[PDB]
Amino acid sequence: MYVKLISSDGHEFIVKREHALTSGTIKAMLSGPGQFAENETNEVNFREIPSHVLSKVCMYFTYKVRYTNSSTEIPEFPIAPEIALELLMAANFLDC
Amino acid sequence: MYVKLISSDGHEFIVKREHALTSGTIKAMLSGPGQFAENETNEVNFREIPSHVLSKVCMYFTYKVRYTNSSTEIPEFPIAPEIALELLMAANFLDC
Amino acid sequence: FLTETGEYYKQEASNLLQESNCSQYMEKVLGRLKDEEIRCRKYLHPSSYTKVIHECQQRMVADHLQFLHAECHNIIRQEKKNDMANMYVLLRAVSTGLPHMIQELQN
Amino acid sequence: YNLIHLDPRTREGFTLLHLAVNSNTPVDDFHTNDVCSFPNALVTKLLLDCGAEVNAVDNEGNSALHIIVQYNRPISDFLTLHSIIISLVEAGAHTDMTNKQNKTPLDKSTTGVSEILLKTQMKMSLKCLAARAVRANDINYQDQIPRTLEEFVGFH
Amino acid sequence: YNLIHLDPRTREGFTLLHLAVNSNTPVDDFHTNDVCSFPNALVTKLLLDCGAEVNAVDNEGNSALHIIVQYNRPISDFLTLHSIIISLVEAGAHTDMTNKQNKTPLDKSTTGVSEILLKTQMKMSLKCLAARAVRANDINYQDQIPRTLEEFVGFH
Amino acid sequence: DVFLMIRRHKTTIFTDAKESSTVFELKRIVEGILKRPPDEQRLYKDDQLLDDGKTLGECGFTSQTARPQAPATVGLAFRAFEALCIEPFSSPPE
Amino acid sequence: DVFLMIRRHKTTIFTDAKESSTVFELKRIVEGILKRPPDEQRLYKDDQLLDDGKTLGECGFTSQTARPQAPATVGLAFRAFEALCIEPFSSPPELP
Amino acid sequence: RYWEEYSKGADYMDCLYRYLNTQFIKKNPLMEIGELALDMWRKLMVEPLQAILIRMLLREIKNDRGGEDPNQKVIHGVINSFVHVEQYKKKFPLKFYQEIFESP
Structure with a gap:
């Protein structure tokens, strides 16, 4: 299943749902009266997360679902100094 | 606190009592009408275990007490080829 | 045993109620309960402590709430401090003991 | 318990306990994947409570x-x-049990977590060390030890 | 809970939680050794139940x-x-927390068992990696992030 | 084992294909998740056209280059053909 | 971390001592076990006398030569001087 | 009627207050909003209605024993509310239900 993530730039960020449920609030956003049980779009809009940070959090979703159990080498996540501050705030907001 | 494990040849292998109770039957042989709660002799008469293999059993007792919780690449227990198959049934009798 | 102690303490609750007022019934009941915490400690398994005490409570102080709740009015409205303490310990263990006494005190 | 005493055997020799702990046991594509996911702690515990052959x-x-x-x-x-x-x-598990390819369960681990988790449960015994020493140098143990020790030596 | 809110501090800076999980916590020579021992699971659970400072x-x-x-x-x-x-x-103990020498509890393990047992409890989060990348290159995060994140960055 | 970032004008899809897989099945995945016919979906790779016959093994999507921490990106354009319409996200300096 | 097998004619005592310890501690131990005062017993090492003064660290009871899996034997003679008459262990059977 | 639309409403509002329960409530007496919405139900709705609910619940089950057919969903829903309202209690989750229903 695929869910959409909308930034403040309008960038849709379609991500497989099982990877996108690692963050707590995206699980919470799709819960309650935001389920929309028709399986047509299944989108959540972030009014205060820029696109250059949703890209990083989606890359982290894929990275974490890939390396959740492979405790072999666990390669480091590449975080630029420019992206470092807003990425922390986004992970805090999403409980990522 | 020093149980005296006699052997088939009279070799009284006096060992620390806490060391010897790592084996089930020596724990059982001192339990019941063999307690002798007087800390005088507390002797055990193995009338079926040769002295040469009871000595190896006592080295095993000390080795196990020392390297129980360590598990930090414990040294291999030296069992001679000729004394094995005697130590095997000795440890079958004296469980563990 | 729980069936047996239930009958015995129902009989004892009916006997105490026939010769004592509420100012004396509660003291005798707390005497029985304090003894029952001993008559079951030195005889029964430790798992049976809570069952026997709870069962003798709901045979002697929870089968006679009508006697205790009705007499709670005169106990509270006259500041009977020795009696009010005994009623509170008795009525706390009962499931629906306090929610009336509380109200009475508030009034 | 009745089915365990029936002792089922898959074509690969997998007993009822082997399948309950194997992650290679297939689950069909329907909603059983949402619930029946293997290995399952409750299934293995229930099998062991019903006298499953742990060894x-x-x-x-x-x-x-x-x-x-x-x-x-x-x-x-x-x-x-x-x-x-x-x-x-x-x-009833024997932590040092040796399979047909001379592999301890620590040897067939391929995982630090499982290896050291098992090592925290490995009660060392002189019987196991003596069995390993007997098997390694190939002493003729036939009829010279109790029969229960012969299969015990075969275990190691 | 009252005493924990009072927040005692040992001369080494150990709070109530540190002494309940330490192995160097002194026990008197009397019969307390028969009952009291440290670290103790029940004491730590009780302290964490009363809202002790887990970090x-x-x-x-x-x-x-x-x-x-x-x-x-x-x-x-x-x-x-x-x-x-x-x-x-x-x-809520941050498993990636660093001391003044920047040593995570994985680094300060001196034991395979405890290291892997912590690794099984280390839910990797983007927040931890982002905080580590923020504090690694000395990015000024004062008042530019949530107040609940300034201490979080200070953990790393 | 090879991770891709499908890039439309603004849409982006994070897919996970195998080491050596055909372009047809990922094209079908994109069709299924956007509900569009395949005749207007042509996959790019750094301003290089692709057809529905090649595979990711020789296209350059090496598993040592398309690591999920920084997945290799591809482009799409949709025709009612269109060229690359990739828009950078943003970059606010510290 | 030194392990010793103090040998009588037949009686054997399995003792453990620290890496920095002297002969007097072992004399006190065997007094506490054999109920023999130390003024009539003297320890030994591979059939040569040892003095009450020097420590076991330099006496030859190093940690790598008296490991618990193979402790080093120590003689013991009691005054009734009497020479060391330690009886060896039983003869292991030949390989079948 | 006011429990089926409120038990789901309590869980839905727990999702809405996810950041509050995670970053504020747990660190700092206080209860999670999912738990709070229920402890404001077993202290303001059920406990004042201990007499009315139970004496009506036992009357409905007694009518079933007599031969009548009460609304199974309503009776089972109200009875299940005594145990669902304390689902956040770690020690004895069936303590409210036992003392309010099983004993009488």
């Missing part, structure tokens, strides 16, 4: 303990690995 | 987690190390 050996040689320790997800669901390991060990 | 940092820098991942007798009492590790982790 059962398939035709490959793996016991009920060699099969689990090869689990490829030791961290995300570490609870249902640790629970099965302790349930096996505390009931 | 308390002493003068050296060691957190509540750093003191028990250094425990030197894992296999003997694996129950009382597993219980305290999972209780600390479930109580």
Whole structure:
């Protein structure tokens, strides 16, 4: 299943749902009266997360679902100094 | 606190009592009408275990007490080829 | 045993109620309960402590709430401090003991 | 308990306990994937409570303990690995049991988590060390030891 | 709970939680050795139930987690190390926290058992990696992030 | 084992294909998740056209280059053909 | 961390001592076990006398030569001087 | 009627207050909003209605024993509310239900 993530730039960020449920609030956003049980779009809009940070959090979703159990080498996540501050705030907001 | 494990040849292998109770039957042989709660002799008469293999059993007792919780690449227990198959049934009798 | 102690303490609750007022019934009941915490400690398994005490409570102080709740009015409205303490310990263990006494005190 | 005493055997020798701890046991594509996910701690515990042969050996040689320790997800669901390991060990499992390819369950681990989790349950015994020493140098143990020790030497 | 809110501090900076998970906590020579022992799972669980400071940092820098991942007798009492590790982790102890020497509890393990048992409880989060990348290159995060994140960055 | 970032004008899809897989099945995946016919979906790779016959093994999507921490990106354009319409996200300096 | 097998004619005592310890501690131990005062017993090492003064660290009881899996034997003679008459263990059977 | 639309409403509002329960409530007496919405139900709705609910619940089950057919969903829903309202209690989750229903 695929869910959409909308930034403040309008960038849709379609991500497989099982990877996108690692963050707590995206699980919470799709819960309650935001389920929309028709399986047509299944989108959540972030009014205060820029696109250059949703890209990083989606890359982290894929990275974490890939390396959740492979405790072999666990390669480091590449975080630029420019992206470092807003990425922390986004992970805090999403409980990522 | 020093149980005296006699052997088939009279070799009284006096060992620390806490060391010897790592084996089930020596724990059982001192339990019941063999307690002798007087800390005088507390002797055990193995009338079926040769002295040469009871000595190896006592080295095993000390080795196990020392390297129980360590598990930090414990040294291999030296069992001679000729004394094995005697130590095997000795440890079958004296469980563990 | 729980069936047996239930009958015995129902009989004892009916006997105490026939010769004592509420100012004396509660003291005798707390005497029985304090003894029952001993008559079951030195005889029964430790798992049976809570069952026997709870069962003798709901045979002697929870089968006679009508006697205790009705007499709670005169106990509270006259500041009977020795009696009010005994009623509170008795009525706390009962499931629906306090929610009336509380109200009475508030009034 | 009745089915366990029937002692079923898959074509690969997998007993009822082997399949309950194996992550290679297939689950059909319907909603059973949402609930019936293997290995399951509750299934293994229920099998062991019903007298399952914990030391059962398939035709490959793996016991009920060699099969689990090869689990490829030791961290995300570490609870249902640790629970099965302790349930096996505390009931009847031989931690040092040697399969047909001379492999200890520590050898067939491929995972630090399972290896050291099993090492925390490995009560060292002089009987196991003596059995290893007898097997390694190939002493003729036929009829010179109790029969229960002969299969015990065959275990190692 | 009242005493925890009073927040005692040992001369080493150990809070109530540090002494309940330490192995160097002194016990008097009398019969207390028969009953009282440290680390103790029940005491740590009770302290965490009363809202103890799970991320308390002493003068050296060691957190509540750093003191028990250094425990030197894992296999003997694996129950009382597993219980305290999972209780600390479930109580919010940041498993990536660094002391004044920048040593995570994985680094300050000195033991395979405790290191892997912590690794099984280390839910990797983007927040931890982002905070580590923020603090690694000295990015000014003062008042530019949530106040609940300034201490979070200070953990790393 | 090879991770891709499908890039439309603004849409982006994070897919996970195998080491050596055909372009047809990922094209079908994109069709299924956007509900569009395949005749207007042509996959790019650094301003290089692709057809529905090649595979990711020789296209340059090496598993040592398309690591999920920084997945290799591809482009799409949709025709009612269009060229690359990739828009950078943003970059606010510290 | 030194392990010793103090040998009588037949009686054997399995003792453990620290890496920095002297002969007097072992004399006190065997007094506490054999109920023999130390003024009539003297320890030994591969059938040569040892003095009450020097420590076991330099006496030859190093940690790598008296490991618990193979402790080093120590003689013991009691005044009734009497020479060391330690009886060896039983003869292991030949390989079948 | 006011429990089926409120038990789901309590869980839905727990999702809405996810950041509050995670970053504020757990660190700092206080209860999670999912738990708070229920402890404001077993202290303001059920406990004042201990007499009315139970004496009507036992009357409905007694009518079933007599031969009548009460609304199974309503009776089972109200009875299940005594145990669902305390689902956040770690020690004795069936303590409210036992003392309010099983004993009488």
